[PDB]
Amino acid sequence: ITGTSTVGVGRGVLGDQKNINTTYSTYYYLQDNTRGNGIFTYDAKYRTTLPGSLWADADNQFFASYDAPAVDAHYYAGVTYDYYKNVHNRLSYDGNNAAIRSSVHYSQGYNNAFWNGSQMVYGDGDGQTFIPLSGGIDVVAHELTHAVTDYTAGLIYQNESGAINEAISDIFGTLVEFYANKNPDWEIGEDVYTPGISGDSLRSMSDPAKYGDPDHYSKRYTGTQDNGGVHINSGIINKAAYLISQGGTHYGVSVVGIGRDKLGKIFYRALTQYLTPTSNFSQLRAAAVQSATDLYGSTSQEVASVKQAFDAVGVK
Numbered sequence: 001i002t003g004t005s006t007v008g009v010g011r012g013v014l015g016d017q018k019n020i021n022t023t024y025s026t027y028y029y030l031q032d033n034t035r036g037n038g039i040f041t042y043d044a045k046y047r048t049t050l051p052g053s054l055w056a057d058a059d060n061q062f063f064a065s066y067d068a069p070a071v072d073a074h075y076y077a078g079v080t081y082d083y084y085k086n087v088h089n090r091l092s093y094d095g096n097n098a099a100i101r102s103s104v105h106y107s108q109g110y111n112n113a114f115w116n117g118s119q120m121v122y123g124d125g126d127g128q129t130f131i132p133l134s135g136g137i138d139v140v141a142h143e144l145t146h147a148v149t150d151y152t153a154g155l156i157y158q159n160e161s162g163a164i165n166e167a168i169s170d171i172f173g174t175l176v177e178f179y180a181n182k183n184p185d186w187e188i189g190e191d192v193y194t195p196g197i198s199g200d201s202l203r204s205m206s207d208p209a210k211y212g213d214p215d216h217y218s219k220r221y222t223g224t225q226d227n228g229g230v231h232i233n234s235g236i237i238n239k240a241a242y243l244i245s246q247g248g249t250h251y252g253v254s255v256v257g258i259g260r261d262k263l264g265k266i267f268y269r270a271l272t273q274y275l276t277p278t279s280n281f282s283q284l285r286a287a288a289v290q291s292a293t294d295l296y297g298s299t300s301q302e303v304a305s306v307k308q309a310f311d312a313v314g315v316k
């Protein structure tokens with residue numbers, strides 16, 4: 001909407017207070033004009049029609065329970081925008097400051113979040129498997145990264161290219177979590193998964209097998225569930241990314257870590273310059289090797305570590 005930029009205050013899903021960029025015109029809207037062509041957050045009102053209604057509030061204070069998922073969707077979309085702009089010089093998901101749209105309160109008891117080709121969508125969870133999923137900064141950044149992938153490599157969401165699509169979202173979701181520097185880790189969704197169980201998450205990048213996902217190409221899922229295992233075989237690539245950043249010895253193969261910033265640079269360049277819609281795991285290795293060569297030189301430690309990491313997970 002047309003109005004004047006304002007700053008509201010509210011509480012997120014985990015009870016933390018934060019300031020949010022809003023727009024005033026009769027009501028205060030969850031419309032952040034300070035980033036690109038805007039960040040816009042919508043109320044789906046427990047239904048499945050999208051996007052729903054642009055979120056309107058009478059007093060620019062967002063402390064109601066019903067407000068909390070909207071506060072976090074809005075705020076963490078902004079953090080993710082900031083990461084891509086400040087770290088990769090990328091302006092929104094299309095590189096041209098496309099408006100970022102999110103809807104919360106999608107359906108009833110909905111234990112997921114997703115990017116629907118046009119916008120981010122967050123369930124509230126059923127209160128047992130999940131609490132409202134926008135409470136996870138890694139979840140929000142995972143979803144917005146699907147938009148980045150759509151506009152760049154375009155990885156088709158099935159089989160190995162789909163597992164790469166998933167891993168790219170987990171990698172940059174995690175790097176956004178570290179960028180914001182609030183309880184960062186290499187696990188996915190820990191802040192919103194199973195409120196009755198401490199210390200678990202949906203997935204682990206540092207040890208995918210902790211939640212049953214493969215950490216070596218020989219253990220890949222080859223059936224048809226989950227679009228050919230896109231949330232399962234992502235563990236193979238997630239483990240390689242973790243090893244590139246942090247190092248380790250895995251199935252007897254040693255990897256010297258080069259840190260998160262260089263991980264991010266290598267995989268951002270691979271995503272935007274070398275990957276294609278049908279890239280498989282072997283082609284991702286080649287793309288990452290070439291990206292590290294572009295950035296650091298053929299004989300660099302960085303290139304050596306990329307090769308060791310893919311060796312360690314059985315990807316040639």
Ligand SMILES: Cc1cc(C(=O)NCC(F)(F)F)no1
Binds near residue numbers: 226
């Ligand atoms: C099946 C299935 C979907 C997901 C998933 O990653 N959901 C998106 C997230 F951001 F909420 F985590 N994991 O298994």
Ligand SMILES: [Ca+2]
Binds near residue numbers: 061062063
């Ligand atoms: Ca209010």
Ligand SMILES: [Ca+2]
Binds near residue numbers: 182183185190191
């Ligand atoms: Ca965390």
Ligand SMILES: [Ca+2]
Binds near residue numbers: 177186189
């Ligand atoms: Ca995490």
Ligand SMILES: [Ca+2]
Binds near residue numbers: 190192195197198
């Ligand atoms: Ca839990």
Ligand SMILES: [Zn+2]
Binds near residue numbers: 142146166169
């Ligand atoms: Zn995903």
